[PDB]
């Protein structure tokens, strides 16, 4: 016992069109509306201000007075999503969307979801695989690739795949993971209220004037297994059609749980009235989650070996501030040690994914405590988790997606059981029934939310408090060097990977985003903790060297930021041409074993200079330290960080040096053990 194999039943529930900051932008301990490493626009304001001939900012939807649970969905086409992305700038959020997409909810509107988040594990770095519509994301979730072949050509980007119910009438013909599950011999099933032709336009997309209330019989064509040739043309009495595509119910799920005959792996699909789609409120999705939870938790033996994973397909047009890792798509935009075959759209040329943030909640006896996990995951991580548990490896996973995204084994603590019960409120259906009842009956008639009448006087804050967080394998180095001969900027990016209890040795892949504050274009890098054998016989990995030639101005001015995973910040400023003929310092880092930090300052110049280190006042109260460093000199300093929860933000300045010269270092020391969240989140952003 005590391993991943102890898990026996796995349930996957997948809702629609809810971004991260829309739900948990206020929750304490998450990288929410007050991320201190927020992206900065060209004008110098943080990205929380968006310019569309006027200044737009996020605002709090207050269901107690308006109808925020009934808002029409926005436009989230592929072109719209990529124009939002803007090749890493992420600043045209209001260019294509509409103002109402900037709203966010609070605990007063969704008590059930916030109770779940406070009680169960939440991922704040979960990204959608394709920056596009629903079906391709669900195609990735059910197959692991949205193309007939893994060469990057003919990848579906619009929407054709379907079952001829709500306008989607296509058929795709590559190997699907449930087929591998059937071939292997693992019991799998799909829970939905109806099969073929259950959903109807006449029922759901005509405002449903006859009912407009509830439909517990259809499935909204969200079954991605039904779009494949083998399934769509399987024998009517065949095993595949029995296991996958039929009519079932959540009451039958409760019956199966109480009979100790739960299918090993269950895809739970939702009816349209409950699947969180913007035509319907989050309260209905809460009620369905309550039904699933009370059905599942109705037995000790079943709950002692069950893992329930709730996630969403895409974030729709709802606002999210982070910028997702992406693979290089042309020249002059960075290099990756791992071959990006099949990850780049051939016709368009821009990369497919990954995309913005969507919530992921893990409910299991091994996933309590209200923890927050900073590793980056995509839809393929679920299939990789099934691979890790059952051993059936899906080859359809693109190599870049295999390297970048994790396998969800870092969320759960399998060294124990923790088989305790769950709070009575979340399993108590009738109060959630009351919430659904007065949500439909009251918030229906309230006026709709605007932005021209509910403009915010300030950017939204965050709930007070920290949360314990889970260890991540990312430890990074980013050093800058100036070529005194060629006058170029050389960036050394490095990774090692942290050993984990869930990761036997510590394979990991990190993505770096380099943001030009003044001039240039964002440049992305992918490094890995293991060697990668390139097609030419080389051995890439563990270290990358790049040259930032195009960032320089006409007079040598350079000013840029280096981002990453888990709040890795390195801000570099200065100038080059005049810097040649006097001294210059350089800053290097070393992660001590016991969670402390070591800072080394290296001088190769010609005259002595004084260098002062002044930490941010929030983390610690000891004073700045200054050293008079000579030419060809170096000194090392040990910085204690246990009282700051193992986070650092240092500003290194110097005298007798160039103007505008300033170095900024910031991040979290990774040691392989769970720790707390960032203390700086609850400090007001502006």
Q: How far apart are CA 245 and CA 351, in angstroms?
A: 33
CA distances for 147 relative to 144, 152, 343, angstroms? 9, 7, 10
| CB 18, CB 316: distance < 8 Å | yes
Q: Between residues 317 and 328, which has the closer beta carbon with respect to Ca ion?
A: 317
Find where tokens 């009934």 sit: 70
Task: Of 82, 149, 679, give the one whose Cα is nearest residue 398.
Answer: 149
Span interacting with Ca ion, options 30-38, 146-154, 308-316, 618-626, rule CB under 5 A: 308-316
The residue whose Cβ lies closest to Ca ion is 134
Q: Between residues 272 and 525, which has the closer beta carbon with respect to Ca ion?
A: 272
Span interacting with Ca ion, options 26-34, 305-313, 354-362, 371-379, rule CB under 5 A: 305-313
Long-range contacts (CB closer than 8 Å, 24 or more residues apart) made by 247-252? 247/192, 247/193, 247/194, 247/195, 247/198, 247/217, 248/189, 248/190, 248/191, 248/192, 248/193, 249/191, 249/193, 249/216, 250/191, 250/288, 250/291, 250/292, 250/295, 251/295, 252/191
Q: Between residues 159 and 575, which has the closer beta carbon with respect to Ca ion?
A: 159
Strands in 483-632 per DSSP E = 489-495, 509-516, 523-528, 532-533, 539-540, 543-547, 558-562, 569-574, 585-591, 597-603, 609-615, 625-629
Kind and range of the H or E run holding 676? strand 675-676
Report helix, strand or coil for 419. coil
Identify residues 7-36 at the interface with Ca ion (CB under 5 A): 16
Identify residues 314-373 at the interface with Ca ion (CB under 5 A): 314
Fill in the DSSP letter of residue 48: T
Identify residues 419-478 at the interface with Ca ion (CB under 5 A): none
Q: Count other C-beta atoms under 10 Å from residue 297's C-beta.
A: 18
Q: Between residues 132 and 522, which has the closer beta carbon with respect to Ca ion?
A: 132
Q: Compute the least distance from the CB of residue 314 to Ca ion, in Å.
A: 5
Q: How far apart are CA 202 and CA 67, in angstroms?
A: 25
Residues with Cβ within 8 Å of 395's Cβ and at least 6 positions away in sequence, in order, are none
| CB 574, CB 568: distance < 8 Å | no
276 touches Ca ion (CB under 5 A) = no
Q: Between residues 96 and 491, which has the closer beta carbon with respect to Ca ion?
A: 96
Q: Between residues 15 and 337, which has the closer beta carbon with respect to Ca ion?
A: 15
Q: Between residues 156 and 573, which has the closer beta carbon with respect to Ca ion?
A: 156
Report helix, strand or coil for 370. coil
Q: Count other C-beta atoms under 10 Å from residue 607's C-beta.
A: 12
Q: Compute the least distance from the CB of residue 17 to Ca ion, in Å.
A: 5
User: Residues in contact with Ca ion, total (CB under 5 A)?
Assistant: 4
Q: Compute the least distance from the CB of residue 167 to Ca ion, in Å.
A: 14
Span interacting with Ca ion, options 132-140, 294-302, 407-415, 455-463, rule CB under 5 A: 132-140
Q: What share of the chain is helix, strand, coil (3-state, %, to 5)?
A: 20, 25, 55
Q: Between residues 134 and 513, which has the closer beta carbon with respect to Ca ion?
A: 134
CA atoms in the 13 A half-sphere facing the CB of 108: 9
Residues with Cβ within 8 Å of 394's Cβ and at least 6 positions away in sequence, in order, are 143, 144, 177, 180, 383, 387
Q: Between residues 271 and 541, which has the closer beta carbon with respect to Ca ion?
A: 271
Q: Is the Cα dihedral 103, 104, 107, 113 positive or negative?
A: positive
Fill in the DSSP letter of residue 443: H
Token pair in block for residue 313:
């397909």
Span interacting with Ca ion, options 126-134, 171-179, 222-230, 262-270, rule CB under 5 A: 126-134
Q: Between residues 135 and 462, which has the closer beta carbon with respect to Ca ion?
A: 135
Out of 91, 276, 313, 561, point to the residue binding Ca ion (CB under 5 A). Answer: 313
Q: Between residues 9 and 18, which has the closer beta carbon with respect to Ca ion?
A: 18
Q: Between residues 106 and 141, which has the closer beta carbon with respect to Ca ion?
A: 141
Span interacting with Ca ion, options 133-141, 291-299, 337-345, 483-491, rule CB under 5 A: 133-141
Q: Between residues 68 and 139, which has the closer beta carbon with respect to Ca ion?
A: 139
Span interacting with Ca ion, options 253-261, 311-319, 431-439, 626-634, rule CB under 5 A: 311-319
Any idea how long the chain is? 686
Q: Compute the least distance from the CB of residue 313 to Ca ion, in Å.
A: 4
Out of 134, 218, 223, 306, point to the residue binding Ca ion (CB under 5 A). Answer: 134
Q: Compute the least distance from the CB of residue 131 to Ca ion, in Å.
A: 13
Helices (H) and strands (E) in the chain, counts: 16, 29
Q: How far apart are CA 364 and CA 417, in angstroms?
A: 10
Q: How far apart are CA 653 and CA 475, in angstroms?
A: 25
Span interacting with Ca ion, options 246-254, 306-314, 349-357, 539-547, rule CB under 5 A: 306-314
CA distances for 223 relative to 13, 368, 549, 667, angstroms? 12, 30, 49, 42
Q: Between residues 314 and 670, which has the closer beta carbon with respect to Ca ion?
A: 314
Token pair in block for residue 372:
């927050």
Q: How far apart are CA 238 and CA 417, in angstroms?
A: 38
Q: Compute the least distance from the CB of residue 562 to Ca ion, in Å.
A: 33
Q: Between residues 134 and 515, which has the closer beta carbon with respect to Ca ion?
A: 134
Contact positions vs Ca ion (CB under 5 A): 16, 134, 313-314
């Amino acid at each position: 016992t005590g391993t991943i194999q102890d898990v026996q039943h796995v349930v996957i529930l997948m809702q629609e069109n809810r971004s991260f900051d829309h739900y948990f932008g206020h929750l304490n301990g998450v990288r929410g509306f007050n991320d201190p490493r927020a992206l900065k626009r060209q004008d110098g304001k943080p990205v929380w201000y968006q310019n569309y001939k006027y200044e737009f900012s996020p605002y709090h939807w207050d269901t107690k007075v308006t109808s925020a649970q009934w808002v029409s969905s926005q436009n989230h086409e592929w072109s719209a999503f990529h124009a939002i992305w803007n090749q890493g700038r992420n600043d045209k959020w209001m260019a294509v969307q509409y103002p109402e997409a900037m709203g966010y909810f609070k605990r007063g509107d969704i008590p059930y979801y916030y109770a779940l988040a406070d009680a169960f594990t939440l991922c704040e770095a979960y990204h959608q695989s394709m920056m596009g519509p629903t079906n391709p994301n669900r195609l990735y979730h059910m197959s692991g690739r949205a193309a007939p072949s893994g060469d990057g050509k003919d990848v579906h980007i619009g929407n054709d795949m379907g079952d001829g119910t709500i306008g989607a009438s296509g058929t795709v013909d590559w190997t699907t993971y449930p087929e591998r599950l059937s071939a292997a011999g693992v019991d799998w099933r799909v829970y939905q209220e109806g099969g073929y032709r259950s959903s109807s336009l006449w029922y759901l997309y005509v405002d449903a004037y006859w009912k407009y209330r509830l439909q517990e019989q259809n499935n909204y064509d969200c079954n991605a297994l039904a779009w494949f040739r083998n399934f769509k043309n399987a024998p009517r009495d065949s095993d595949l059609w029995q296991r996958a595509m039929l009519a079932r119910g959540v009451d039958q799920l409760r019956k199966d749980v109480q009979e100790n005959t739960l299918p090993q792996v269950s895809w739970i699909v939702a009816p349209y009235c409950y699947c969180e789609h913007p035509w319907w409120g989050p309260s209905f999705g809460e009620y369905y989650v309550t039904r699933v939870l009370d059905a599942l938790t109705s037995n000790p033996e079943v709950w002692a070996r069950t893992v329930f994973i709730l996630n969403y397909d895409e974030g729709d047009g709802f606002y999210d501030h982070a910028s997702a890792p992406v693979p290089p798509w042309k020249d002059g935009v960075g290099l990756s040690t791992v071959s990006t075959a099949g990850e780049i759209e051939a016709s368009s040329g821009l990369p497919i994914g990954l995309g913005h943030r969507v919530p992921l909640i893990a409910i299991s006896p091994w996933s309590k405590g209200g923890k927050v996990s900073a590793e980056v995951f995509d839809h393929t991580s679920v299939l990789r988790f099934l691979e890790r548990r059952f051993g059936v490896v899906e080859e359809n996973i693109s190599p870049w997606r295999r390297a970048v995204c994790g396998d969800l084994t870092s969320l759960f603590d399998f060294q124990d059981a923790g088989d305790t019960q769950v709070a009575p409120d979340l399993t108590n259906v009738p109060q959630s029934d009351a919430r659904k009842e007065d949500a439909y009956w009251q918030q229906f008639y309230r006026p709709s939310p605007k932005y021209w009448s509910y403009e915010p006087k300030s950017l939204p804050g965050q709930e007070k408090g920290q949360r314990p967080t889970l260890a991540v394998p990312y430890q990074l180095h980013a050093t800058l060097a100036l070529d005194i001969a060629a006058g170029k900027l050389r960036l050394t990016l490095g990774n090692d990977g942290m050993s984990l209890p869930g990761n036997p040795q510590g394979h990991s892949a990190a993505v770096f985003q380099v943001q030009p504050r003044e001039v240039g274009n964002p440049r992305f890098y992918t490094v890995t903790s293991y060697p990668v054998v390139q097609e030419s016989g080389e051995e890439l990995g563990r270290t990358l060297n790049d040259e930032l030639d195009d960032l320089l101005d006409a007079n040598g001015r350079y000013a840029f930021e280096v981002h990453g995973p888990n709040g890795f910040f390195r801000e570099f400023h200065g100038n080059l041409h005049l810097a040649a003929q006097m001294a210059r310092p350089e800053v290097s880092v070393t992660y001590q074993r016991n969670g402390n930090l070591q800072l080394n300052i290296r001088n190769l110049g010609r005259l002595p200079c004084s260098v002062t280190v002044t930490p941010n006042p929030a983390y610690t109260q000891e004073g700045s330290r200054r050293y008079e460093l000579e030419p060809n000199q170096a000194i090392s300093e040990v910085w204690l960080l246990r009282s700051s929860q193992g986070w650092y933000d240092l500003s290194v300045t110097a005298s007798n040096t160039e103007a505008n010269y300033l170095r900024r270092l910031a991040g979290h020391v990774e040691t392989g053990k769970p720790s707390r969240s960032d203390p700086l989140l609850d400090i007001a952003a502006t």
